[PDB]
Every structure is written in C-alpha cells, then in structure tokens.
Short mmCIF file of N, CA and C in Angstrom, two decimals:
data_model
loop_
_atom_site.label_atom_id
_atom_site.label_comp_id
_atom_site.label_asym_id
_atom_site.label_seq_id
_atom_site.Cartn_x
_atom_site.Cartn_y
_atom_site.Cartn_z
N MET A 1 0.44 13.31 24.98
CA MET A 1 1.75 12.70 24.69
C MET A 1 1.81 12.21 23.25
N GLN A 2 2.00 13.14 22.32
CA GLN A 2 2.15 12.78 20.92
C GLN A 2 3.57 12.31 20.64
N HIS A 3 3.75 11.01 20.65
CA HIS A 3 5.05 10.42 20.39
C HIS A 3 5.05 9.77 19.01
N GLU A 4 6.02 10.12 18.19
CA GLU A 4 6.10 9.58 16.84
C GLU A 4 7.16 8.51 16.74
N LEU A 5 6.84 7.46 16.00
CA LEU A 5 7.73 6.33 15.83
C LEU A 5 7.79 5.94 14.36
N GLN A 6 8.73 5.08 14.02
CA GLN A 6 8.86 4.57 12.66
C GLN A 6 8.28 3.16 12.60
N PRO A 7 8.01 2.63 11.39
CA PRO A 7 7.42 1.29 11.21
C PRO A 7 7.95 0.25 12.19
N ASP A 8 9.26 0.21 12.40
CA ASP A 8 9.81 -0.69 13.40
C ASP A 8 10.17 0.09 14.65
N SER A 9 9.30 -0.02 15.65
CA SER A 9 9.46 0.66 16.92
C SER A 9 8.52 0.02 17.94
N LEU A 10 8.59 0.47 19.19
CA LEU A 10 7.82 -0.14 20.26
C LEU A 10 6.60 0.71 20.62
N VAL A 11 5.43 0.14 20.37
CA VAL A 11 4.16 0.77 20.68
C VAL A 11 3.50 0.05 21.86
N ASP A 12 2.49 0.67 22.46
CA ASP A 12 1.75 0.05 23.55
C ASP A 12 0.27 -0.05 23.20
N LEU A 13 -0.48 -0.84 23.97
CA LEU A 13 -1.91 -1.06 23.71
C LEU A 13 -2.68 0.25 23.58
N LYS A 14 -2.42 1.19 24.48
CA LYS A 14 -3.12 2.48 24.48
C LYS A 14 -2.91 3.15 23.13
N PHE A 15 -1.69 3.03 22.65
CA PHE A 15 -1.30 3.58 21.38
C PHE A 15 -2.12 2.96 20.27
N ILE A 16 -2.14 1.63 20.22
CA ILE A 16 -2.94 0.91 19.23
C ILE A 16 -4.39 1.37 19.26
N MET A 17 -4.96 1.48 20.45
CA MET A 17 -6.34 1.91 20.60
C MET A 17 -6.54 3.34 20.10
N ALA A 18 -5.53 4.18 20.29
CA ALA A 18 -5.54 5.53 19.72
C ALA A 18 -5.41 5.48 18.20
N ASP A 19 -4.52 4.62 17.73
CA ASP A 19 -4.25 4.43 16.30
C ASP A 19 -5.47 3.88 15.57
N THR A 20 -6.16 2.95 16.20
CA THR A 20 -7.24 2.22 15.55
C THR A 20 -8.62 2.76 15.93
N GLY A 21 -8.80 3.05 17.21
CA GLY A 21 -10.10 3.46 17.71
C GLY A 21 -10.94 2.27 18.13
N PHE A 22 -10.30 1.11 18.23
CA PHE A 22 -11.00 -0.13 18.54
C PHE A 22 -10.50 -0.73 19.85
N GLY A 23 -11.05 -1.89 20.20
CA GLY A 23 -10.72 -2.54 21.46
C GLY A 23 -9.58 -3.53 21.34
N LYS A 24 -8.92 -3.78 22.47
CA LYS A 24 -7.77 -4.69 22.56
C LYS A 24 -8.04 -6.03 21.88
N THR A 25 -9.21 -6.60 22.15
CA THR A 25 -9.60 -7.89 21.57
C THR A 25 -9.49 -7.86 20.04
N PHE A 26 -10.00 -6.79 19.44
CA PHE A 26 -9.94 -6.59 18.01
C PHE A 26 -8.49 -6.53 17.55
N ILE A 27 -7.66 -5.84 18.32
CA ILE A 27 -6.26 -5.66 17.98
C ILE A 27 -5.56 -6.99 17.77
N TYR A 28 -5.50 -7.80 18.82
CA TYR A 28 -4.77 -9.05 18.78
C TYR A 28 -5.26 -9.94 17.64
N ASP A 29 -6.57 -10.00 17.44
CA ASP A 29 -7.12 -10.81 16.35
C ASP A 29 -6.75 -10.22 14.99
N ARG A 30 -7.06 -8.94 14.82
CA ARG A 30 -6.89 -8.27 13.54
C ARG A 30 -5.42 -8.18 13.13
N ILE A 31 -4.55 -7.89 14.09
CA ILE A 31 -3.13 -7.74 13.80
C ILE A 31 -2.51 -9.10 13.46
N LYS A 32 -2.94 -10.16 14.15
CA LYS A 32 -2.52 -11.50 13.77
C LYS A 32 -2.91 -11.78 12.32
N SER A 33 -4.14 -11.41 11.97
CA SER A 33 -4.65 -11.59 10.62
C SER A 33 -3.91 -10.69 9.63
N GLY A 34 -3.36 -9.58 10.12
CA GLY A 34 -2.61 -8.68 9.27
C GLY A 34 -1.44 -9.37 8.61
N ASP A 35 -0.44 -9.72 9.42
CA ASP A 35 0.68 -10.53 8.94
C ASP A 35 1.40 -11.20 10.11
N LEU A 36 0.63 -11.52 11.15
CA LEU A 36 1.17 -12.09 12.39
C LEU A 36 2.12 -11.10 13.08
N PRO A 37 1.79 -10.69 14.31
CA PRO A 37 2.57 -9.68 15.04
C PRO A 37 4.01 -10.10 15.29
N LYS A 38 4.93 -9.23 14.89
CA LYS A 38 6.34 -9.41 15.22
C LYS A 38 6.58 -8.81 16.60
N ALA A 39 5.57 -8.08 17.08
CA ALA A 39 5.53 -7.53 18.44
C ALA A 39 6.11 -8.49 19.46
N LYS A 40 6.75 -7.94 20.47
CA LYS A 40 7.45 -8.74 21.44
C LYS A 40 6.57 -8.89 22.67
N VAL A 41 5.64 -9.82 22.59
CA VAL A 41 4.73 -10.09 23.67
C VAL A 41 5.13 -11.40 24.36
N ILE A 42 5.32 -11.33 25.67
CA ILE A 42 5.81 -12.47 26.42
C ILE A 42 4.88 -12.80 27.58
N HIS A 43 4.17 -11.81 28.07
CA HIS A 43 3.32 -11.99 29.24
C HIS A 43 1.95 -11.36 29.01
N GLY A 44 1.33 -11.73 27.89
CA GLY A 44 0.05 -11.15 27.50
C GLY A 44 0.18 -9.72 27.00
N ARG A 45 1.18 -9.02 27.52
CA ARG A 45 1.53 -7.69 27.07
C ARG A 45 3.04 -7.54 27.11
N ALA A 46 3.53 -6.43 26.55
CA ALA A 46 4.93 -6.04 26.64
C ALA A 46 5.19 -4.84 25.73
N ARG A 47 5.58 -5.11 24.49
CA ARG A 47 5.85 -4.06 23.51
C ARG A 47 5.40 -4.53 22.14
N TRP A 48 4.70 -3.68 21.41
CA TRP A 48 4.17 -4.07 20.12
C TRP A 48 4.95 -3.37 19.03
N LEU A 49 5.19 -4.07 17.94
CA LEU A 49 5.88 -3.48 16.81
C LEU A 49 4.89 -2.79 15.90
N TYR A 50 5.17 -1.54 15.59
CA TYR A 50 4.26 -0.72 14.79
C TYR A 50 4.04 -1.33 13.41
N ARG A 51 5.03 -2.07 12.92
CA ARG A 51 4.95 -2.78 11.65
C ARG A 51 3.66 -3.60 11.56
N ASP A 52 3.33 -4.29 12.65
CA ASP A 52 2.14 -5.12 12.72
C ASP A 52 0.89 -4.28 12.52
N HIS A 53 0.97 -3.03 12.95
CA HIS A 53 -0.13 -2.10 12.74
C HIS A 53 -0.22 -1.78 11.27
N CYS A 54 0.93 -1.46 10.69
CA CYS A 54 1.00 -1.09 9.28
C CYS A 54 0.43 -2.21 8.41
N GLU A 55 0.82 -3.45 8.71
CA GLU A 55 0.38 -4.58 7.92
C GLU A 55 -1.09 -4.90 8.17
N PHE A 56 -1.53 -4.83 9.43
CA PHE A 56 -2.93 -5.04 9.75
C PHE A 56 -3.81 -3.93 9.13
N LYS A 57 -3.40 -2.68 9.34
CA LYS A 57 -4.10 -1.52 8.78
C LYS A 57 -4.27 -1.68 7.29
N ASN A 58 -3.25 -2.25 6.68
CA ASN A 58 -3.21 -2.48 5.24
C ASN A 58 -4.45 -3.25 4.77
N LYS A 59 -4.80 -4.31 5.49
CA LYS A 59 -5.88 -5.18 5.06
C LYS A 59 -7.23 -4.50 5.31
N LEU A 60 -7.33 -3.75 6.40
CA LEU A 60 -8.56 -3.04 6.72
C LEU A 60 -8.74 -1.82 5.82
N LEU A 61 -7.65 -1.14 5.56
CA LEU A 61 -7.66 0.05 4.71
C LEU A 61 -7.99 -0.33 3.27
N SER A 62 -7.59 -1.53 2.88
CA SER A 62 -7.87 -2.04 1.55
C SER A 62 -9.35 -2.40 1.41
N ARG A 63 -9.91 -3.02 2.45
CA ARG A 63 -11.31 -3.46 2.42
C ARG A 63 -12.25 -2.34 2.82
N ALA A 64 -11.70 -1.31 3.47
CA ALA A 64 -12.47 -0.18 3.98
C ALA A 64 -13.52 -0.65 4.99
N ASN A 65 -13.06 -1.02 6.18
CA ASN A 65 -13.96 -1.52 7.21
C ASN A 65 -14.77 -0.39 7.82
N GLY A 66 -16.04 -0.68 8.07
CA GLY A 66 -16.92 0.32 8.63
C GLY A 66 -17.93 0.79 7.62
#
C-alpha cells in the first residue's frame, strides 16, 4: 500500500515506522524533539501530521544519526 501524502496530511504509526525504520517509542520522543507534533493525537493514537516527520527528520538528517 504505497500511499503518498503531502507535508500536511494524516499518517499512521505503521507509516512512521516505515518512514523511519525505528520503534514507536523513538517516534513520539524524537518527533516531539523535532518541533513538537502538530499530529492530532487524543487517545494515545489517532492521526499524525507528516509535517512532524519532516521537522523531526530534519534534525536527524542534519546530525546524521547512525
């Protein structure tokens, strides 16, 4: 299921894990550190904004993690 979205769109955890290759725990921490998730999370999960990925990825891509 290759679904393409734009910076502002609704992503899911599985997507993030595909996007990043890392675990959920890393996501919530790292994305908060990115620029605080604008993602619409109300019950531990819901819908994530891809923007938060872009901004989080930004800091990791800059530092070159790994």
